[PDB]
Amino acid sequence: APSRNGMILKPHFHKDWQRRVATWFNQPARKIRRRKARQARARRIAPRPAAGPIRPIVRCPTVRYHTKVRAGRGFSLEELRVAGIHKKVARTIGISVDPRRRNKSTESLQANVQRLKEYRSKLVLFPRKPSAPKKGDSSAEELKLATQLTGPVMPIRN
Amino acid sequence: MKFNPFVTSDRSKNRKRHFNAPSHIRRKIMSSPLSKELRQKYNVRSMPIRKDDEVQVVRGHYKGQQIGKVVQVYRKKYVIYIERVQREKANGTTVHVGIHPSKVVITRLKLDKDRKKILERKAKSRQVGKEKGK
């Protein structure tokens, strides 16, 4: 029954809510396990970036956020083709690729092309056979200074 | 302080393990220190007790300077019996009184091949530990 004055409330506890209750007592253990798995994978992929493949520049698709810039799912085929990267080789050399994304404009396409060219200029590629290098490869002296980098590769800035 | 997460410090768990340890863990548990001469000779501090080692009783109503040969080791009751420690009951028959090995010191050991193997292993491990500690 209503008291003198107050707010009308509609608590959503008319079901058997006490049977479906999610306590969070395993939150620190979950964080510890996720960390351990993260470092385990980082050790597993020895010189490769810990974060993963590079990703592209995208604009948020809304009037509320279209002024901001995200990290996308993957580079699209138009950008790869105009940057001279094969769609199959990009994935195995570290470029995230998706075929769904289109390119309505040219500024975003050119920005991502610049990103891919910078990534090619920056990455160090190990020999396919440790004894004999190949033409499309990096020379031996800079292999000694190849290290994992933390965080996303070439982080997105607004 | 214990840091190993896989070994417990719970009182009830420890007591349960102690009171239901199997016989080959009972042998380990009922160990008693060696005398000073034996300790200096073998570079070993403690030894599980055997059937016919002799003993000095250090604590209890029967403490004294009498060397006594163990007659048998009752592992179920966590007790050893010494041929001299004993008391007479009502009818006059004499029964052995139980003494815990922890309150017991060996005068000299029964040198069996397994015993000397154990002694040499203990001495070697202790010596390598000390050398590492150097």
Binding site: F25 | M1, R11
Partner: protein, 259 residues
């Protein structure tokens, strides 16, 4: 308690008649536990009143600024001899209670070196007090792995771990803390302020970078500064016994006028 404790049975009240107290009773059977009263907090066996639930609000959150304020207050109070002594620590021989030693002790490796250092710094009396205080806990906490209790000893604040922790680990009552990760729970044992602390030179140097000065913000924290003083000159004795305030006072009426 278990979610189904006390409800494992199947019982119905006999109802009006039978000259019984109208409570659910274990139904049927040739057993002592038959027609005995199953549910309800008043029955033997049966359910508790308002069973405790695992989703009680066990944890609390405190503002980061408030945590930093508490840490700063504890650190400031640790530097006053009166408060440290009132905490019970024996420091009458300590040469200077903001005790600072060089970074050489940061590389100690053996407990004997740590004990010798404490003896030299005359803090061994606190350790002896801890040894004397080691006793047996009272109550049911004994059978719950809280068998032994003892007094808190001094804290040691370091900057790098180079065997420092191993060296002072075994001495009872000593609490080791990194200078970059202090916690109030160990800085002010009990909620009482003024624990005896021993600093290293590097930690003492890093303190004002950690918490900033009055005119310089903290470099290691994003944006933090020391809390502002509500009153600066807290010498009430002066504030009364100064001429400029004593001048503007009426004469003190101090003659009693009894009935």
């Amino acid at each position: 308690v278990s979610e189904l404790a006390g409800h494992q049975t199947s019982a119905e009240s006999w109802g009006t008649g039978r000259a019984v107290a109208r409570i659910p009773r274990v139904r049927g059977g040739g057993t002592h536990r038959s027609g005995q009263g199953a549910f309800g907090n008043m029955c033997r066996g049966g359910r508790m009143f308002a069973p405790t639930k695992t989703w009680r609000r066990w944890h609390r959150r405190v503002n980061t600024t408030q945590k930093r304020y508490a840490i700063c207050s504890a650190l400031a109070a640790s530097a006053l001899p009166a408060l440290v002594m009132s905490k019970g620590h024996r420091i009458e021989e300590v040469p200077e209670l903001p005790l600072v030693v060089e970074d050489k002790v940061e590389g100690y490796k053996k407990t004997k070196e740590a004990v010798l250092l404490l003896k030299k710094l005359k803090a061994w009396n606190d350790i002896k007090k801890v040894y004397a205080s080691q006793r047996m806990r009272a109550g049911k906490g004994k059978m719950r792995n809280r068998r032994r209790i003892q007094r808190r000893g001094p804290c040691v604040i370091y900057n790098e771990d180079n065997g420092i922790v191993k060296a002072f680990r075994n001495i009872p009552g000593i609490t080791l803390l990194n200078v970059t990760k202090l916690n109030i729970l160990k800085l002010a044992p009990g909620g009482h302020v003024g624990r005896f602390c021993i600093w290293t030179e590097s930690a003492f140097r890093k303190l004002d970078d950690l918490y900033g000065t009055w005119r310089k913000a903290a470099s290691l924290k994003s944006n933090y500064n020391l809390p502002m003083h509500k009153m600066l000159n807290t010498d009430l004795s002066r504030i009364l016994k100064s001429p400029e305030i004593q001048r503007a006072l009426r004469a003190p009426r101090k003659k009693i006028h009894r009935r």
